[PDB]
Amino acid sequence: GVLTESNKKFLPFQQFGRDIADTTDAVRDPQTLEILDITPCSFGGVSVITPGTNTSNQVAVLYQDVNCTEVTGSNVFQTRAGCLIGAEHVNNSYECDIPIGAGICAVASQSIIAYTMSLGAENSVAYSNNSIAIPTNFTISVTTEILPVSMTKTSVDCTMYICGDSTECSNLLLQYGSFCTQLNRALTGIAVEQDKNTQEVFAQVKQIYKTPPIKDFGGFNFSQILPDPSKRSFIEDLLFNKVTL
Amino acid sequence: SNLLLQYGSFCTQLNRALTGIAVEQDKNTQEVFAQVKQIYKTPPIKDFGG
Amino acid sequence: AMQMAYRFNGIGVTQNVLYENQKLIANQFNSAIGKIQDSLSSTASALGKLQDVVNQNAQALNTLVKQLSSNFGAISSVLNDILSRLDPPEAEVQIDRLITGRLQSLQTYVTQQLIRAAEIRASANLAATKMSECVLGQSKRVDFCGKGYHLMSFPQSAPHGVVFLHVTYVPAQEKNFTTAPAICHDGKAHFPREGVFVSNGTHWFVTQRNFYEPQIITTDNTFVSGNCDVVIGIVNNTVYDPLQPELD
Amino acid sequence: QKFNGLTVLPPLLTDEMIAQYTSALLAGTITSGWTFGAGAALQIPFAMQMAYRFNGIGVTQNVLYENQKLIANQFNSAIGKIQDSLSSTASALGKLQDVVNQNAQALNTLVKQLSSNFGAISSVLNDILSRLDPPEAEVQIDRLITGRLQSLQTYVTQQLIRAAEIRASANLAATKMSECVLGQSKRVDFCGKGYH
Numbered sequence A: 001g002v003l004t005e006s007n008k009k010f011l012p013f014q015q016f017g018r019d020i021a022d023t024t025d026a027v028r029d030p031q032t033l034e035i036l037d038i039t040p041c042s043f044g045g046v047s048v049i050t051p052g053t054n055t056s057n058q059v060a061v062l063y064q065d066v067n068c069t070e071v072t073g074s075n076v077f078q079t080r081a082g083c084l085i086g087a088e089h090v091n092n093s094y095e096c097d098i099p100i101g102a103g104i105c106a107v108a109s110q111s112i113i114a115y116t117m118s119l120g121a122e123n124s125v126a127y128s129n130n131s132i133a134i135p136t137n138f139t140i141s142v143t144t145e146i147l148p149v150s151m152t153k154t155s156v157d158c159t160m161y162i163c164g165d166s167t168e169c170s171n172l173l174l175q176y177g178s179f180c181t182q183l184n185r186a187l188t189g190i191a192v193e194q195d196k197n198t199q200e201v202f203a204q205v206k207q208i209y210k211t212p213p214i215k216d217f218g219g220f221n222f223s224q225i226l227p228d229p230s231k232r233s234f235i236e237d238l239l240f241n242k243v244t245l
Numbered sequence B: 001s002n003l004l005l006q007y008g009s010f011c012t013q014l015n016r017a018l019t020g021i022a023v024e025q026d027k028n029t030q031e032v033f034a035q036v037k038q039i040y041k042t043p044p045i046k047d048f049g050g
Numbered sequence C: 001a002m003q004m005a006y007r008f009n010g011i012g013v014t015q016n017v018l019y020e021n022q023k024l025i026a027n028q029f030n031s032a033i034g035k036i037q038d039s040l041s042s043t044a045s046a047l048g049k050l051q052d053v054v055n056q057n058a059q060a061l062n063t064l065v066k067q068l069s070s071n072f073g074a075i076s077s078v079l080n081d082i083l084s085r086l087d088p089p090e091a092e093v094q095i096d097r098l099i100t101g102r103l104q105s106l107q108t109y110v111t112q113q114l115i116r117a118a119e120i121r122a123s124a125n126l127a128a129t130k131m132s133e134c135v136l137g138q139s140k141r142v143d144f145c146g147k148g149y150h151l152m153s154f155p156q157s158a159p160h161g162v163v164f165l166h167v168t169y170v171p172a173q174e175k176n177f178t179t180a181p182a183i184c185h186d187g188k189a190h191f192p193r194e195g196v197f198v199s200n201g202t203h204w205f206v207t208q209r210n211f212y213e214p215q216i217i218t219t220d221n222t223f224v225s226g227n228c229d230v231v232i233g234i235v236n237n238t239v240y241d242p243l244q245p246e247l248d
Numbered sequence D: 001q002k003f004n005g006l007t008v009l010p011p012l013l014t015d016e017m018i019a020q021y022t023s024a025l026l027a028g029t030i031t032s033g034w035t036f037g038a039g040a041a042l043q044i045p046f047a048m049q050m051a052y053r054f055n056g057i058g059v060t061q062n063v064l065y066e067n068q069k070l071i072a073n074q075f076n077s078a079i080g081k082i083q084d085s086l087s088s089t090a091s092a093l094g095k096l097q098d099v100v101n102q103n104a105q106a107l108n109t110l111v112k113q114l115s116s117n118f119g120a121i122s123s124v125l126n127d128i129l130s131r132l133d134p135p136e137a138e139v140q141i142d143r144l145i146t147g148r149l150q151s152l153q154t155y156v157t158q159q160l161i162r163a164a165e166i167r168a169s170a171n172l173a174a175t176k177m178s179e180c181v182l183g184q185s186k187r188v189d190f191c192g193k194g195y196h
């Protein structure tokens, strides 16, 4: 630690003071009878800022909640998050791709920049106590929205896992009571919950409606969405080839 | 440290769990508050019907 | 067609707007569907809410299995070697160490899985709400099931999830006119029955609040109450009534 | 509080940015009615917006254009009342303070858990490491390590559960902002006791 001079004055019979959770915070030196605080010197996490490997290779480094009075090294800047090395501060602001902290963010013009984030396109609405706007055109638009409903119904058994077909390991395990009963019961419970999740989200209808073969829906195409007996329809296949199970 | 190293990946797992909740709080705040695409600014006059 | 007409009526647009614009709406619909197809086929990483589940579950299982490599401060990891090359007295101690450690790891994994499954159950409850309220019907709560006013949606399956195609109606091409709450006519104060009063500078009409389509101010589409005294901001004008001239 | 290892990372959207957000939202819902939530903002005189929301709740708008003054005065006297009713009364912002202290208690207990011996002969690691030979010190070190690790893991599980609950409340907040600011929800008692 780093040693500083203490305002706290020991009583004539105490040697060293501990602050909380048993860490020696102050100590009296033996050769001078002075009192010194012992504080930990700077330390903390380190993170990297990268625009991705595929884009480029130059990256920045952020030392977390530390001054840059303590230590590649092109430009330094002190932000409320800590020390930013390798990025040049810019004044103008955009919508930022890399969160940092306290609003700062971070590649553009073959370099890594740091800059306070811009909230949005700052425009004003005009107001007057007798004017009203009214739309004349309209666009119907389709948005996707993705939700999860289930995980893999997994199961693990202690007796085969911690022992692995070892008899004496099992004979020693049985002393620990019924931790295996609890674990098997918990996993089976979440498996039951997982099947119930799907059974609830999808089985909302108690018929099976099949559209008539005629597709004249007011001139609305549905051929890209409705099921095709060629394959489960086209769209679900498209998503079905987008996971890495 | 060399003794703890023999305890598997407990330390990294806990650090990752706390990192997860920390990056989740960011999303919570952004999702609650960032529901405007632009930044509307109030007109100077204030005569909203009284 | 009339299903769409009712839904337009529900959002707050008189159903007529559909019929003369049916071909245009169909074309916009199909173009938008093709655009969604293109976006999902080419640009990935819009489906992150399922990739994260699969990847994170797999990673948790992977570290659970990896835990067997660690020696947990015992003499060795593989059980048979210590159980052969140690006397049964010391064997019981080493086995005890390994058992407590591995059991602790397994129980921690189970707790993490419990919390993860609770989060997934919350998401599935929200999915059931969305399916029931924005597929089996039309919902009029803003920014629930779209971005803009809601027209319909279609469910679509996924590997371990569900994806909704929300068909929503977005107004645009605003034009601003001069408005006023009422009209005064013979000391009598006329308010709009449904819609707002508009003026393109010199003449006044009545429209619906989500589509410009002016109509001459008739006594049928405006209920009247009060008088020309207290409404702050009235404007004088005329109110045609079909009843009067037709007798002549 | 943070002494060793423990730390707090600043939140991305710092306080000024959040205040600017809630200024933008407030101005948008003052001038533009609803439409800034759905499409581009369509400015509307505020009296007509109030009348149209009356019409939404099941009352013909004539009542407002005839009683605009009374409505304005009630609104003003209500804002004035609420600001002072928050100013004077203590424990009026509880449901934030409670989570703050509960998290602080968790962290403080986590720190204080160091002092415990867990059956070892000391608590500060350098001293048990500074008066015992390796073959004898290793067992004491192992006991103390497993104790600290079990404490920390308990803390992490606590924080996970609390964060899940706060995330539930934050999704509730997002929903409430969506259908009770951008629009005018008719779900009774969902926002404000009474008609909304």
Ligand SMILES: *[C@@H]1O[C@H](CO)[C@@H](O[C@@H]2O[C@H](CO)[C@@H](O)[C@H](O)[C@H]2NC(C)=O)[C@H](O)[C@H]1NC(C)=O
Pocket: A137, A138, C024, C027, C028
């Ligand atoms: C409303 O918006 C639509 C969408 O752009 C307009 O339709 C386009 O009109 C231009 C010229 O009139 C054509 O070149 C485009 O081919 C049209 N698009 C489609 C999809 O048909 C329309 O003109 C706008 N105004 C009205 C009154 O409908």
Ligand SMILES: *[C@@H]1O[C@H](CO)[C@@H](O[C@@H]2O[C@H](CO)[C@@H](O)[C@H](O)[C@H]2NC(C)=O)[C@H](O)[C@H]1NC(C)=O
Pocket: C200, C201, C202, C203
């Ligand atoms: C507002 O729109 C009306 C649409 O009819 C315009 O009315 C024009 O002038 C008289 C009004 O009685 C009509 O007989 C004409 O036929 C209209 N012009 C055309 C080309 O049809 C009116 O001029 C518009 N307002 C302004 C300020 O121009």
Ligand SMILES: *[C@@H]1O[C@H](CO)[C@@H](O[C@@H]2O[C@H](CO)[C@@H](O)[C@H](O)[C@H]2NC(C)=O)[C@H](O)[C@H]1NC(C)=O
Pocket: D069, D070, D073, D074
């Ligand atoms: C509805 O109740 C309100 C309560 O505020 C009444 O408004 C006030 O009534 C008191 C009663 O003496 C008056 O002194 C105030 O001047 C009124 N306020 C205003 C802004 O005028 C209101 O009168 C009641 N409505 C009816 C129709 O009686």
Ligand SMILES: *[C@@H]1O[C@H](CO)[C@@H](O)[C@H](O)[C@H]1NC(C)=O
Pocket: A031, A032
């Ligand atoms: C301690 O030792 C130093 C150097 O040997 C000497 O100057 C001093 O007088 C001694 N006593 C105290 C109380 O410092």
Ligand SMILES: *[C@@H]1O[C@H](CO)[C@@H](O)[C@H](O)[C@H]1NC(C)=O
Pocket: A067, A068, A069
């Ligand atoms: C960092 O060091 C500078 C050196 O002048 C000092 O002024 C500043 O207060 C320090 N920042 C912190 C957070 O200690």
Ligand SMILES: *[C@@H]1O[C@H](CO)[C@@H](O)[C@H](O)[C@H]1NC(C)=O
Pocket: A090, A091
């Ligand atoms: C950005 O701000 C700095 C701060 O003084 C200023 O020196 C510079 O001219 C500004 N413009 C830039 C860097 O383009």
Ligand SMILES: *[C@@H]1O[C@H](CO)[C@@H](O)[C@H](O)[C@H]1NC(C)=O
Pocket: A126, A127, A128, A131, C174, C175, C176
């Ligand atoms: C009418 O709209 C235009 C653009 O849509 C805008 O520039 C103008 O300010 C609006 N009218 C008034 C009086 O603000």
Ligand SMILES: *[C@@H]1O[C@H](CO)[C@@H](O)[C@H](O)[C@H]1NC(C)=O
Pocket: A128, A129, A130, B045, B047, C232, C233
């Ligand atoms: C609208 O605002 C203007 C000030 O810009 C004011 O002079 C006018 O009286 C207001 N309209 C009404 C009907 O009071």
Ligand SMILES: *[C@@H]1O[C@H](CO)[C@@H](O)[C@H](O)[C@H]1NC(C)=O
Pocket: A220, A221, A222, A223, A224
């Ligand atoms: C719908 O689009 C498909 C192409 O995806 C096309 O083959 C089909 O003819 C279209 N339907 C209509 C009715 O035009």
Ligand SMILES: *[C@@H]1O[C@H](CO)[C@@H](O)[C@H](O)[C@H]1NC(C)=O
Pocket: C184, C234, C235, C236
């Ligand atoms: C409407 O006409 C009457 C006729 O006497 C007049 O007193 C009143 O001021 C007029 N109102 C407006 C807004 O011009």
